[PDB]
Write a protein that binds this ligand. Structure first.
Ligand SMILES: Cc1cc2c(nc3c(=O)[nH]c(=O)nc-3n2C[C@H](O)[C@H](O)[C@H](O)COP(=O)(O)OP(=O)(O)OC[C@H]2O[C@@H](n3cnc4c(N)ncnc43)[C@H](O)[C@@H]2O)c(O)c1C
Length: 375
């Protein structure tokens, strides 16, 4: 039996970020089922940072995370965590009222947000079909996230604070014993006053092992693919491109193009694979909107974006389950919110007020709590 102050289940971006901030204050042990910590959703994202995306709570967590991403502590990483990647949201269906509403709502959080006419949008991504473009919003502050550097920065930070990150340690049994949580894996047993459930799409399965009422988390499949651009086209500086109704997105990635139908098909928690129909739909939508020809993609994959009913993230203690803390419902936003979520969850776990910079972004304990979910 190994004792810790905080026992975290899951070493994806959620468990890693929470563990990183916790590790300055006590012994953190993170238990990860897979042989590597980023095998599931944290290794499958589009790795983008967009403030004007998700619910108001999501947008506040994303905005509050920028300070850490742009100014991490010395030794956290060797190169910047963010690289510039503006986001351009294009109206392909002639809906100026919706385009206006998205512009006005986005500019309220991003003062530099711009409204583009169709000619400006086509100047920025010249493969757009001009006759299908009716305008666009443009966020000059968008960024791509170096998810490997960020994730490993969190994980290394735990280990440098005498914490442990244990892979090939699937939590198989969970029990409340003598005022602490005990977790049995095949390879060992672990004990801590606080159990941090950061198991991604599996968070409700973990609650199942513990006898704790679940949140109603719904994993949703999103597929993506990479394909070659035409040889005479330099797309490496293009913004992230999204349609106004999030029917698809397209962005440069490693000399290639990354496309997606931006789907959200409800599924059970599992090692999710792309569906041929997902890929064909993404290819059709991109070819409908642009002059690009997509041969069979060179690489396809899918990951899980997991939501509770209201679309907001969850960080708080369970009702009537002492020491059981949820870090869940990261949705499509777990990377870009990870710094605020990790710092906020660590404060809440320790029963401390949220730091001032987080409260200045409108964050509070109430908007993160799982107990807000009414059945
Ligand atoms: C699929 C997908 C997701 C995107 C995408 N885009 C973005 C994006 O642009 N920006 C962003 O912030 N998030 C984006 N997301 C979302 C981001 O991927 C998720 O929000 C984020 O990765 C969720 O992080 P979590 O830590 O909550 O989930 P993980 O699956 O990474 O980690 C959970 C861990 O728990 C572990 N676990 C489960 N059961 C366990 C057990 N019994 N014992 C031990 N470990 C367990 C799992 O093995 C796993 O490693 C995207 O284009 C796609 C296609």
């Amino acid at each position: 039996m190994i004792e810790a102050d905080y026992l975290v289940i899951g070493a994806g971006i959620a468990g890693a970020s929470t563990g990183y901030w916790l590790s300055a204050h006590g012994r953190v042990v993170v238990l990860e089922r897979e042989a590597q910590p980023g095998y599931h959703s944290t290794g499958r994202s589009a790795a983008h940072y967009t403030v004007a995306y998700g619910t108001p709570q999501v947008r506040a967590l994303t905005a509050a995370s920028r300070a850490f991403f742009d100014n991490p502590p010395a030794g956290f990483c060797e190169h910047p965590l963010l690289s510039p990647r503006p986001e351009m949201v294009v109206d392909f269906s002639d809906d100026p009222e919706e385009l206006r509403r998205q512009y006005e709502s986005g500019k309220a959080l991003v003062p530099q947000m711009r409204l583009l006419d169709a000619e400006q949008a086509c100047s920025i991504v010249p493969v757009l079909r001009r006759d299908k473009v009716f305008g666009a919003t443009y966020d000059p502050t968008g960024a791509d996230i170096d998810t490997d550097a960020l994730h490993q920065g969190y994980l290394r930070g735990i280990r440098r604070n005498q914490g442990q990150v244990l892979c090939n340690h699937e939590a198989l049994e969970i029990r409340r014993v003598d005022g602490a949580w005990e977790v049995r894996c095949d390879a060992g047993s672990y004990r801590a006053a606080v159990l941090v459930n950061a198991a991604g799409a599996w968070c409700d399965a973990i609650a199942g092992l513990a006898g704790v009422r679940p949140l109603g988390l719904q994993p949703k499949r999103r597929s993506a693919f990479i394909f070659a651009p035409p040889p005479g086209i330099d797309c490496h500086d293009w913004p992230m491109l999204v349609s106004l109704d999030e029917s698809f997105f397209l962005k440069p990635d490693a000399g290639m193009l990354l496309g997606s139908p931006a789907n959200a098909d409800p599924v059970e928690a599992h090692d999710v694979q792309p569906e041929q129909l997902d890929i064909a739909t993404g290819m059709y939508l991109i070819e409908e909107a642009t002059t690009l020809t997509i041969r069979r993609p060179e690489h396809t994959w899918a990951g899980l974006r997991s939501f509770v009913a209201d679309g907001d993230l969850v960080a708080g203690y369970a009702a009537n389950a002492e020491g059981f803390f949820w870090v869940a419902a990261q949705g499509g936003y777990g990377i870009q919110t990870s710094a605020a979520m990790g710092e906020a969850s660590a404060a809440l776990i320790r029963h401390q007020p949220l730091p001032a910079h987080l409260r200045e972004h409108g964050l509070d304990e109430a908007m993160l709590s799982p107990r807000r979910l009414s059945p």
